[PDB]
Amino acid sequence: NICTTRGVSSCQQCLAVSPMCAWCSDEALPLGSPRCDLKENLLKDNCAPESIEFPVSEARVLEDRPLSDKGSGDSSQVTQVSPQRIALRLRPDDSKNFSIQVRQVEDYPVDIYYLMDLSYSMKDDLWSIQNLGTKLATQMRKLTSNLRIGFGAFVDKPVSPYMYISPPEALENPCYDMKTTCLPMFGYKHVLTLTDQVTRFNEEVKKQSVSRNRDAPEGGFDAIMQATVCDEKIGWRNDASHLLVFTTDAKTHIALDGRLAGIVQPNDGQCHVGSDNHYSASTTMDYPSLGLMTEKLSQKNINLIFAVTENVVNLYQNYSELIPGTTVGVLSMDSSNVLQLIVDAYGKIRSKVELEVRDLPEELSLSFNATCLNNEVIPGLKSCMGLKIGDTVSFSIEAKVRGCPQEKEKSFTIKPVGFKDSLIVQVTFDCDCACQAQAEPNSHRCNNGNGTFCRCGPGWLGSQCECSEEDYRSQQDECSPREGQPVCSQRGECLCGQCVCHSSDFGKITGKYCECDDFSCVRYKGEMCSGHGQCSCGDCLCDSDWTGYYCNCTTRTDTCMSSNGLLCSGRGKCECGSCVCIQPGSYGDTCEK
Amino acid sequence: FNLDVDSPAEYSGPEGSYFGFAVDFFVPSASSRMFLLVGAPKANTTQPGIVEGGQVLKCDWSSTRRCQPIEFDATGNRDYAKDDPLEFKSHQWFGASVRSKQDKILACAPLYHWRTEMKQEREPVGTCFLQDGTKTVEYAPCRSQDIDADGQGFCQGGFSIDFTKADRVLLGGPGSFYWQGQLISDQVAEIVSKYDPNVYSIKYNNQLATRTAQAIFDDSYLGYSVAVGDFNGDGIDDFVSGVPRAARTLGMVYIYDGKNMSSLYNFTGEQMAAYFGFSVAATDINGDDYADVFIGAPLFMDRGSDGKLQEVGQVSVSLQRASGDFQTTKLNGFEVFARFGSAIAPLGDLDQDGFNDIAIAAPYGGEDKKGIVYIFNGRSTGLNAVPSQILEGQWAARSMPPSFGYSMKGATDIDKNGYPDLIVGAFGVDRAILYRARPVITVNAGLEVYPSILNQDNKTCSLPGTALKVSCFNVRFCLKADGKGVLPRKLNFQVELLLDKLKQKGAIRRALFLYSRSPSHSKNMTISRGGLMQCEELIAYLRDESEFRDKLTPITIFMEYRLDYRTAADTTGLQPILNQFTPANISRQAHILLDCGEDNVCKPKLEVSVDSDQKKIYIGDDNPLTLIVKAQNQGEGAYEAELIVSIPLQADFIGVVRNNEALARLSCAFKTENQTRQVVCDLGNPMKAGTQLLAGLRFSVHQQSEMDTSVKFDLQIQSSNLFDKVSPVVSHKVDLAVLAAVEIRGVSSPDHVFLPIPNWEHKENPETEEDVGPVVQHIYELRNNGPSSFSKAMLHLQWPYKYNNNTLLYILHYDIDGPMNCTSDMEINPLRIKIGDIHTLGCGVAQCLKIVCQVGRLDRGKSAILYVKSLLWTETFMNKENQNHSYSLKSSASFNVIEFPYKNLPIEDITNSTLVTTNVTWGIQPAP
């Protein structure tokens, strides 16, 4: 399989191969099989069960509170996402799946901040919305019992060429020309902090009065930015549905327009509303871009509604499609229908849900499969729509890691758009084997302890950390009979100084240099060692009754003894089983005749 | 890729003055010197009563780095009647846009408020000052009688300017006609001549200008930025302008015909609010004569891998085609919120490589968002999509983003060294930086190995200081360098090369240089900038095989070089640079091996010859046979060589002649298979090319069989090669022989007798043994000393019977041993008895008795013997005739081997004779 065929070692590359591979770290390792293989194959070789590493990916649950049923409960107790904390662990190239549930709870607290354009064409609307506080509370009591309402207004930056700077009295009465009075120019003023006292919205609105801008584009985006990042003055609640109603009847300015007026410094995510409730940096900071607006609306969890007259509805639809979590509604000139507009905007806004991935590391990737209305499933999507509010939906999240990150305790969050109920993910990667500690670091089996159980260097690392390749004075350490002589006497081949002598059908070879064998001995009188010995490295070892190199001479004396009892009858000398008769006149095998 | 980021030249102006907002070069044709123009739209001036009216500074280049103002104006606001001011110069942003050409400097104040002729008022028409030579004039095209927002009241003319090839000004006002914007183009010659200070609403006759349009187009900001190029082939530059807010804020760019100001093309943006048109440029980027258009969209929001939109900034590059159509590619930014594309500035040919280059800026990127500038190179098929360099701002924000790279200007050479330089503005910190372009050198290097295929044995070289001869080869290196610009006359290259690099990782070293400089050679080359390759070479020799073991991996030499910049920098310290794509290293490898060719199998040629130690062998005993053999392989190497001898039934293997130091100590063994019997010996592996060997083999011959005449053997040599793996069979023979070395022997007992016979008495006739005399025994034997047997043989014995008519020795009986029968010519025991100097007596002197014997088959060592018991006849010696005589009795015998069983071999008869004697003497001497 792949695990064996890749021939990796050290238990770390073995893990890096595939999630399925496993490693064995026995002290009594069986030889001839790779230490890297899938768990079953290691168990086939009977690697000790506690000596196999085989880490396995998983996904736990740390907080699994149930989804709330009503929003009017204790603020901390409301829970719209479950599970709430998850810790998952996976290998350098594996993937794991887990699910998340979201339920748009009913009767949730609601915060409405009515940000209103105050160009001269807005005077009729300013008249028509003098009862909006009470009307809106009366209608919303059906949907939410913890309502709040705010207010704020914008015209445009107070600087030429946007505002009338002459005649000199015009700057203190922009409507001076048409023979009527109106407020001087202003960028953005914070009128009413969010409050539960519905009636006071009506009181505060009646004190307002329109102004006059020279050109059609309004500076609303600069107002939205401050209404988003000045949370402490605006008074956004942590546990509530933030609505930012935006009313206008004209196109809008955008970043880099401030160059015409001498404004080049780019906008930044900071609050500059002074103690007088007027945005102070209006005349020294450019407009904010849609990217920055989207970032700050995501961070502060604001749902932004575009309520605009029918002449510029399409423009703001095309703008909204670039800002996640927004909608559009058509105002009359008199603004007579803003109440119904906001009610239906809230319903539509919470009739959908989409998931944000906040701080995913670059080494991870996520894919979503969404269970949706009526238990149907839609692949690939990370959102759903058509919900009735109160219902519940879930998503199947599948995550994969890319290699082994250098640090293995990162974390990130997943969160629906517009809500703080999120799932916090703790991720860890099992790159390292447990045996890398206390087991592998060193072992005397390799270079007298100078090798991790091996991983030594030149001089030993040739094989088993006991072979040399730096010097090569070679791998044939004394394989030849003598210095400079042929390796293994050319009877085979050697590695690490040991000759693998070849076998033959007519004999076999032995010795470090293959210098000995069991067949190269001499024959005499028809058979090896005369049948009176056995072969050993080309020499005969003779029996007790025989001597000589061929074992050709007998050591016995009973063949020389004569019937008189004397060897050779005392007439000669016995040699190799026969008598050399010295005495003249005597004959016979033993000179006995 | 060649801008000198090390030690640029830095210029700074009054703090908080936006110094460096707009930058440009100054090229006074009447003077040798060059200067930089830097705009400070918020610097305070000496104009009476003007607060932050702005100014333009002229900054030197040589040895001072000083900056000084340009006296475009020195007067406050003009009055209309007595105190009603005509104009308001405070906060006018003078110097916000600067352009220069030859000796004409055009600076504009986009925020100049004008009052008006018809009524007390305040409108920002905008104005420009044009300095040409010593003359200075004011150009205010939008300061006209189009009274208010309906016309040119809010034109803000001078927001963006540019000079044309035809010495005609192009000027944009984004605020005219309800901010529909306006472009206005007037000839320089008329501006300088039609100017009259006492008339404010000056009318120009040769003016080209756009005109208001329907209501839908309000707030388009036409003229936000402008560039000039020729886009219809008529030869006179046309006008390019970006309308960032048009088409529901999508953004567009307008190409207006430079003649009669008509509309040619309109580029359309893709994403709302991207501000498509913030900055534009036009230059030839791909070698066509046609100008290629670049458009920036700093706020373009790209869709990331996760599906999120993110602000990165985008630049659109359009390549003009001969038919006038455009092929467009879109290039995105590299980090979020960095506003890539805020500024585009063609650089000319930054490396003189034949295609112009372009620089694009992201003034809010990098670490701590200090700003970054990217550099791209034009290729023959468009812009190179990967930047070849990156400039990073070194100044941290004081109270405002540094905006390094908000405005740049290129395509000018302050050095006059052939390569254009580049200015960069960092107005957030009130600084402007000048980057010089380093000369570019293209280097071609050559490497040669002689020979490419390396046979190991080609010993040619001699080691210096010794007589040693070493295999070697020739290696040569070359380099060639030149560049398009002001470069020094001679360049010092430091080139080094070491042998077989990819295996010097601690392993054995293998090849050496002629001076054994640790396979490492480093040398200086003072190459003159020119066309010569200036090759050089040295001879490298392999060390002895006993010192290294790698014969498989080809020797892979390695060479590299690096220029000595400190010597190649001019007097101003600017250092050359090598071409981006030129590799500074190269290597080559050769095939050092002997491998029998492509098929990897050698073709041997095997032969053998033999000589016989035993010239002839005698049948009848085991004979050790020694054959002396010489083995040779005249061909290529023979793998697994062996020496083979096939043997017959009548012989068996013994071993080798090991004690003979002149012969090989061969390993040998004996085999038998399928009735085939052979002797095998080992000759090593391989048997090398042309090698010769000698050895001796021992056989045992058991030739006791009778019908064979010679012994025959066959020798051969074989290997495991696929080619010619067997030598011709070499048969040899030794002739058999017959040799029955038969001899005849005899003995007597006793050897002597003494007269008179003790205890003997004379009698008329004998009846017992004691009556005749002392007993004497004679023995004769027929013995064989040779191995060959004989089937038949004959033996003969002679015996002295009677001397002087009287018996000498008397026989009683004869006995036989071995395979013989015997008979006597004289009756044995005729009486049938109850069973001075020594003279010689014998049959020659006395009557002879003879015994003849017949013999059968016998072998070596075996013998047959005849025994005789006899009595010494006493009368012959005690007679008076011999009382004074001593005698030695003589007998003799002979034999013949008459037949042999080996009839097939040549045979000869074998015969001989011998004698046996007994002595008789007088122990007691009688009277003489």
Q: Mind giving me the DSSP string for B285-351?
A: -SSSSS-EEEEEETT-EEE-TTS-EEE--EEEEEEE-TTS-EEEEEEE-SSTTS-TTSEEEEEE-TT
Rounded to a whole number of angstroms, the CA Rg of chain A reads 49
- Give the method of determination: cryo-EM
Integer Cα distance of B798 and A260 in angstroms: 165
Show Cβ contacts of residue A372 under 8 Å, excluding neighbours closer than 6 positions: A378, A381, A384, A386, A393
Find out whether A345 and B294 touch, Cβ atoms under 8 Å: no
How far apart, in whole angstroms, are the C-alpha atoms of residue B577 and residue B352? 13
Question: What is the CA angle B247-B249-B252, rounded to 5?
Answer: 55
Tokens representing B878? 């005690």
Comparing CA positions, the residue from A532, B682, A529, A526 lying closest to residue A518 is A529
Q: How many CB atoms lie within 10 A of CB B879?
A: 11
Contact B131, B104 (CB under 8 A): yes
Report the phi/psi class of residue B772: left, alpha or beta, with left for phi > 0 and alpha for psi in -120 to 50.
alpha
- B646 within 8 A of B718, measured Cβ to Cβ: no
Type of residue at B301 = M
Q: Which sequence spans correspond to the domains of chain B?
A: 440-592, 606-737, 742-922
The residues, any chain, with a CB within 8 Å of residue B300's CB and separated by 6 or more, are B270, B271, B274, B276, B311, B312, B313, B314, B332, B333, B341
Identify the CA nearest to B639 among candidates B700, B679, B597, B596.
B596
> In which region does residue B494 sit, left (phi positive, over 0), alpha (psi from -120 to 50) or beta (all else)?
beta
**Could you tell me which residues come within 8 angstroms of residue A496 by beta carbon, excluding any fewer than 6 positions away?**
A462, A463, A466, A467, A475, A477
What is the SS3 assignment for B192-245? HHCCCCCCCCCCCCCCEECCCCCHHHCCCCECCEEEEECCCCCCCCEEEEEECC
Residue B668 with chain A: CB contacts under 8 Å: 520
Residue A268 marked as a ligand binder? no
Nearest-Å Rg of the Cα atoms of chain B is 65
d(CA B117, CA B124): 14
Beta bridge partners of A52: A24
Q: Retrieve residue A32's tokens.
A: 């001839």
Q: Which fold has domain B440-592?
A: Immunoglobulin-like (2.60.40)
Residues within 8 A of B (CB atoms), A 296-335 only: 314-315, 318-319, 322
| B221-248 b/e (C-beta count within 10 Å ≥ 16 → b) | bbbbbbbbbbbeeeeebbbbbbbbbbbe
> What is the resolution of the experimental data for this entry, in Å?
3.2
Strands A392-401 and A364-371: antiparallel
Same fold, B606-737 and B742-922: yes
Nearest to A256 by CA among B99, B398, B399, B277: B277
Task: Using CB atoms, pick whichever of A292, A472, A524 lies closest to residue B549.
Answer: A472
Are the C-beta atoms of B410 and B24 separated by less than 8 Å? no
Disruptive mutation site among B337, B553, B649, B866 for chain A (greatest number of A CBs within 10 Å): B337
Distance between CA atoms of residues A326 and A228, nearest Å: 14
Q: List A443's β-bridge partners, or say none.
A: none
**Neighbouring C-alpha atoms within 13 Å toward the C-beta of A132:** 29
DSSP 3-state of A547: strand
Q: Report d(CA B904, CA B917) in Å as an integer.
A: 41
Q: How far apart are CA B672 and CA B779, in angstroms?
A: 51
Asked if the Cβ–Cβ distance from A315 to B249 is below 8 Å, we say: yes
Residues of A numbered 400-419 whose beta carbons fall under 8 angstroms of chain B's beta carbons: which are they? none
Q: Do A260 and B682 touch (CB under 8 A)?
A: no
Test mutation, B121, B272, B666, chain A, max A CBs within 10 A: B272
Cα dist from B83 to B78, B80, B147, B456, B630, whole Å: 9, 7, 22, 106, 134
Integer Cα distance of A71 and A169 in angstroms: 54
- H-helix or E-strand containing A345? helix A338-349
Report how far apart, in Å, the C-alpha atoms of B80 and of each of A271, B115, B232 are: 44, 9, 47
- Collapsed DSSP state (helix, strand, coil) of residue A384: strand
Annotate B364-390 with DSSP letters as a single string: T-SGGG--EEEEEEEETTEE-SS-SEE
Distance of alpha carbon B20 from alpha carbon B405, whole angstroms: 10
A22 neighbors A39 (Cβ within 8 angstroms): yes
Query: How many angstroms separate the CA atoms of A31 and A257, rounded?
Result: 76
**Record: contact A289-B311, CB cut-off 8 A:** yes
Q: Which two tokens stand for residue B552?
A: 């498989």
Where b means 16+ CB within 10 Å and e means fewer, B122-143 reads bbbbbbbbbbbeeebbbbbbbb
Tokens of A269: 């995510």
The CATH homologous superfamily of the domain defined by B742-922: ntegrin, alpha v. Chain A, domain 4 (2.60.40.1530)
B12-B18-B21-B26 Cα dihedral, nearest 10 degrees = -40
Q: What share of chain A is helix, strand, coil (3-state, %, to 5)?
A: 20, 30, 50
The verdict on a CB contact (< 8 Å) between B299 and A291 is yes
**Dihedrals φ, ψ of B621, to 5°?**
-155, 165
Report the sign of the C-alpha dihedral through residues B298, B301, B302, B304, in that order: positive
Report whether A117 belongs to an annotated binding site. no
A residues 351..390 contacting B (CB < 8 A): 357, 360, 366, 382
Strand B35-40 relative to strand B23-26: parallel, antiparallel, unpaired? Answer: antiparallel
Q: Which residues are bridge partners to B263 per DSSP?
A: B256
Closest alpha carbon to A234 in A184, A308, A296, A309: A296
| CA atoms of A322 and B302, how far apart (whole Å) | 11
Indicate the burial class of B668 (C-beta count within 10 angstroms; 0-12, 13-18, 19 or more): buried
Phi then psi for residue A508, to 5 deg, are -145, 160
User: Where does B750-846 show beta strands of DSSP type E?
Assistant: 752-755, 775-784, 792-803, 806-807, 809-817, 820-824, 839-841
Helix (H, G, I), strand (E, B) or coil at B853: strand
Is A125 labeled as ligand-binding?
yes
Length of chain B: 928
CB contact under 8 A, B299 and A167: no
Measured CA to CA, the distance from residue A71 to residue A74 in angstroms comes to: 8
**Dist. CA B446–CA A43, nearest whole Å:** 59
Q: Measured between alpha carbons, how far is residue A364 from residues A91, A408, B777 in Å? A: 12, 12, 126
Contact A557, B706 (CB under 8 A): no
Cα separation, B135 vs B147, in Å, equals 30
Strands (E) across B663-741 are located at 668-673, 676-682, 692-701, 710-718, 730-737
> DSSP string covering B249-267, please?
TT-EEEEE-TTT--EEEEE
- Cis geometry, peptide bond prior to residue A92 (ω within 30 degrees of 0): no
For B689-720, b/e burial (b = at least 16 CB within 10 A) is: bebebebbbbbbbebeebebeebebebbbbbe
- Mark the breaks in chain B: residue after which each occurs, C to N over 2.5 Å: 835
Residue of B nearest to A364 (CA): B306
Q: Is the separation of the CB atoms in B499 and B510 below 8 Å?
A: yes
Tokens of residue B642, six digits:
């062996």
Cβ A322–B272 below 8 Å, yes or no? Answer: yes
A202: DSSP letter? H
Please give, rounded to a whole number of angstroms, the shortest distance from the CA of A481 to a CA of chain B. Answer: 14
CB burial class (10 A; 0-12, 13-18, 19+) of residue A354? middle
DSSP summary character for residue A129: G
Task: Indicate the helix (H) or strand (E) that contains A224.
Answer: helix A220-229
Q: Among B444, B766, B478, which Cα is nearest to B581's?
A: B444
Tell me the C-alpha distance between B439 and A471, whole Å: 48
Q: Which residues of B touch A475 (CB under 8 A)?
A: 549
- Asked whether B367 and B397 are in contact (CB, 8 A), the reply is no
Pairing of strands B577-578, B440-450: parallel
The Cα–Cα gap between B170 and B183 comes to 7
Q: Do B287 and B313 form a contact (C-beta atoms < 8 A)?
A: no
Q: Which residues of A fall within a CB distance of 8 Å from B93?
A: 262
Q: What single DSSP character describes residue B42?
A: T
10 Å CB burial of residue B119 (0-12, 13-18, 19+) is exposed
Helices A198-206 & A132-140 angle (0-180, nearest 10)? 160
List A471's β-bridge partners, or say none.
none
Which ranges in A289-330 belong to alpha helices (H)?
Answer: 290-299, 313-320
What is the Cα–Cα distance from B466 to A227, expressed in whole angstroms? Answer: 94
- Residues of chain A in contact with residue B403, where contact means CB-CB under 8 angstroms, are 264
| CATH 2.60.40.1510 matches B606-737 | yes
**Burial class of residue B616 (count of CB atoms within 10 Å of its CB; 0-12, 13-18, 19+):** exposed
Flag whether residue A214 sits within 8 Å of chain B, measured between CB atoms.
yes
Distance CA B349, CA B358 (A): 9
Helix axes A290-299, A220-229, angle to 10 degrees: 30
Strands, DSSP E only, in B413-468?
421-425, 431-435, 440-450, 453-454, 459-462
Place of tokens 């942003």: B93
The answer to the question of whether A116 is labelled as a binding residue is: no
